[PDB]
Amino acid sequence: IIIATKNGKVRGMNLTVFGGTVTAFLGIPYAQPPLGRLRFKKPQSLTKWSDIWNATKYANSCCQNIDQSFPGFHGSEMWNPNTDLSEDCLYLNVWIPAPKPKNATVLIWIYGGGFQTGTSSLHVYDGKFLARVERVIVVSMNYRVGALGFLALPGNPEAPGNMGLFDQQLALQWVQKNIAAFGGNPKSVTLFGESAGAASVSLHLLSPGSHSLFTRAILQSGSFNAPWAVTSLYEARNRTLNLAKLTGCSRENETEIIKCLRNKDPQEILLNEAFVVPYGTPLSVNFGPTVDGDFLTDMPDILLELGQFKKTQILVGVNKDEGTAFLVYGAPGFSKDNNSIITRKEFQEGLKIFFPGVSEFGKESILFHYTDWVDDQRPENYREALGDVVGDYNFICPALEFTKKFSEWGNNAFFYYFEHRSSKLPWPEWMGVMHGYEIEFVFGLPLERRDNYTKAEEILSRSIVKRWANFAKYGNPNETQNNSTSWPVFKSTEQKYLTLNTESTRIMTKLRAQQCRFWTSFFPKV
């Protein structure tokens, strides 16, 4: 099992999947380790070893903070890294069907984590099932997160910002220069990613450097116009300056700040990232993408409205309860271990927690919009309200607006609304269909019948798996039995979208129009 890469030589393994074989290569180095002198710099292209890389283990995950609010609880720990953490973490993975194809479309996964956490080695990103079932190559990479990936002194080559985005980019260049050795087709590449991964993907639609490096895009629960997705340059270097004073790295010219920060033990970077912004929010992104003048030329929303982006089909969508996940990270009244019925005023306190900088008039205007009950008996009205507020403002409305404004340039867009709750999901039922819990289905996890899903969830996952393959290969997410419902194109006038659950595959119009038309045409005025 040995493949010659354009620079180098890797040994992989035979995984046996569903009766056949997928050959995979785990932890291929795609960049020099960004240590010491290179901490905070753009990833630098590798020199050529030859020897043989045993690409037979997931590589190290990038340095990051780890959520430990619930020790020994699957629902939070399943997003925690599962390989050792090092700054030596710029590696990627490749799953390939067996026997080896000759021009097979490839899907490159980009994980989410609020640009602060995440790794490609998580079980729910296992590429073997895709490769097996749909005969695509799957590739996924580790990029830097947190200040190690996004610390910004705009314009200074060292610390330019967006270094994790350049990590992703360099992996995409690796697939361009090497996937054809693996049997992949470089002219047929589809980015799919979720959360910050999806926002990352949307940012690759705008960066000129990334233009030639893929074909299509799939954006799950994220896009760069999300309020958490982009940091202004003013915010970004207030944040890096406070990181400097928190580490004792306060100097007067930027370069000396930077080398002081480079002779700091990584845990003193990581354990101070939490304090750089004074009014955090459960969704605060401490160090995220900025308009760096390199990766991002100007501010993304105008590049989108001006139309200077790559022109291709995109697939975009959201889950029904995107917001509930974050309500337990400090909204009063809310618990993983009770039903979380709240009053109107626990509601209002929750809104302060998520909208700290908003006038009281503005928080009540929110409440007004989300309190026109259809059934005012319903106890859990306010629960549902607050979750829906967080989810709409942070994910659903930005995704709708993004594909709305993307489609009006002759590009074909498909939008989905995922509404099934995993029968083995470990969070309470009141949280519904949570942020991130379609990924098990996009990666075909429930196809393992030994695994505990329900035949229904298996059929559903097989549907979503082939729709995204077909979108990757063809640019149209058709299902090619034609039992299936056909999925039409989102365009601003009609705005049609497709519903994903086990009961049915309905087709619907103008998703949450009345909620989002607040977040688009009123809130920005408060």
Place this chain on the structure above:
Amino acid sequence: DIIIATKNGKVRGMNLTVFGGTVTAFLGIPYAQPPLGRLRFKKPQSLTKWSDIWNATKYANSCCQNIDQSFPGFHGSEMWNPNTDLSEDCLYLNVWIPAPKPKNATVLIWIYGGGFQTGTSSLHVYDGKFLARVERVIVVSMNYRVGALGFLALPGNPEAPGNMGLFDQQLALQWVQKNIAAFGGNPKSVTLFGESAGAASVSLHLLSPGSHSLFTRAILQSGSFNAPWAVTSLYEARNRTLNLAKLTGCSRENETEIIKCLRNKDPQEILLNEAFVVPYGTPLSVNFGPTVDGDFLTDMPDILLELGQFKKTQILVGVNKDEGTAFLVYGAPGFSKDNNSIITRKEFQEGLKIFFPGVSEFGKESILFHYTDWVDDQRPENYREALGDVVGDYNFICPALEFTKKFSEWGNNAFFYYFEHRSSKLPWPEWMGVMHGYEIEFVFGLPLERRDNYTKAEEILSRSIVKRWANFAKYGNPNETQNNSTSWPVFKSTEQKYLTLNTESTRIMTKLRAQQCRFWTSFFPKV
């Protein structure tokens, strides 16, 4: 001959022929001493007697007031202008009685509107002879003082205590109690109905102890004391009467000397300065209106309503489809009686600027956001219509609804109506729709007279508003007939059923414009 002996003296009236019958009418019976000279700005003083015979055979004088002059010759505007001479000597009332003369007829008593600044009972659309003829009820109407002559307020000071016009109405109610049995009516079946400021007056009479024994039920058309125009807080009342003193040259420090100074002033200097007493003001500003005087009103009206200190009786309440459109051609930029009045978006908020002069710009943008979730974002009319609705919902509809809910919650049966039919003879343009005040014709049965080019549908619809109003008067239930009319159900605060009125179909519906009123009741007060 035609003579009735009243306690104050005997009066003479008129035979009128109505639909091959006769109602007998007594027009312009005095119910009080003329509020002249020393009596200006004070409560109505009781009449004593005359030994002569007072022929009640013409409408009396209307009360001193300013007049609508923006549209000379336009029946739509002038139909509301007073149609008799104007004079402080104006406290007179009218009595329509069916023939043969009734023995215990229930009595409808009408209180007119006009923003407490204008109006009079002698208008053609308040003619009670049809009701008397068709439903066999006595109809009674009265003139009460409007404007500063009616509502000048130095609270506490008998010389001008506030609310004299309301006391005028009340003294007319006392006249009905003391005298109507001589005409054949039942003093213990007496329903007050009124419109606009008249319906506000009716709701206040439900609040006021002194009116409690003077009537039995109440009908409220497009009006209620909780409308934002109906009541002025005590202070603000006294500050306008103060500035009126300042404009006429009546600023004294012994506060009664002010009242003397104005009492020697010529009526039209007072009328002439009444508009200026409020800085700015909307097309709906009530310059001198009801106030918390501590006599007619012992507390802020909304307090009394919450505490349940009001008369426990049955009520009929409703509104019109387009309560607001009238007020747009009176100051909103881009509106006219004569073009279709398609306006732009913030021509729209020059409109809100005009009708909400004291609201923040965040509040006005929120009003706009609430009213611009179009069903058809390519419909030109859309903004025009929105503004009508805004002015309408805020000023009449949502308060009527709110009043009926809270009134309903104390155990009495309320009935709510949505009046939805445009008079074919309506003179205003069609874009104005079912305007404020244009139900009154149908309630008073003018469409029953088959000689004024009304539609047959309109006759039928007037006949049923008439017999429903009369049956509510007599029986507490606005049934038309048991067996092929729609049940008019009670307004209960849970369901909030109401009955719509128009020529095509009467239906029961629920929660009239609940999504708008929600904004007015529970977001706007926080702004």
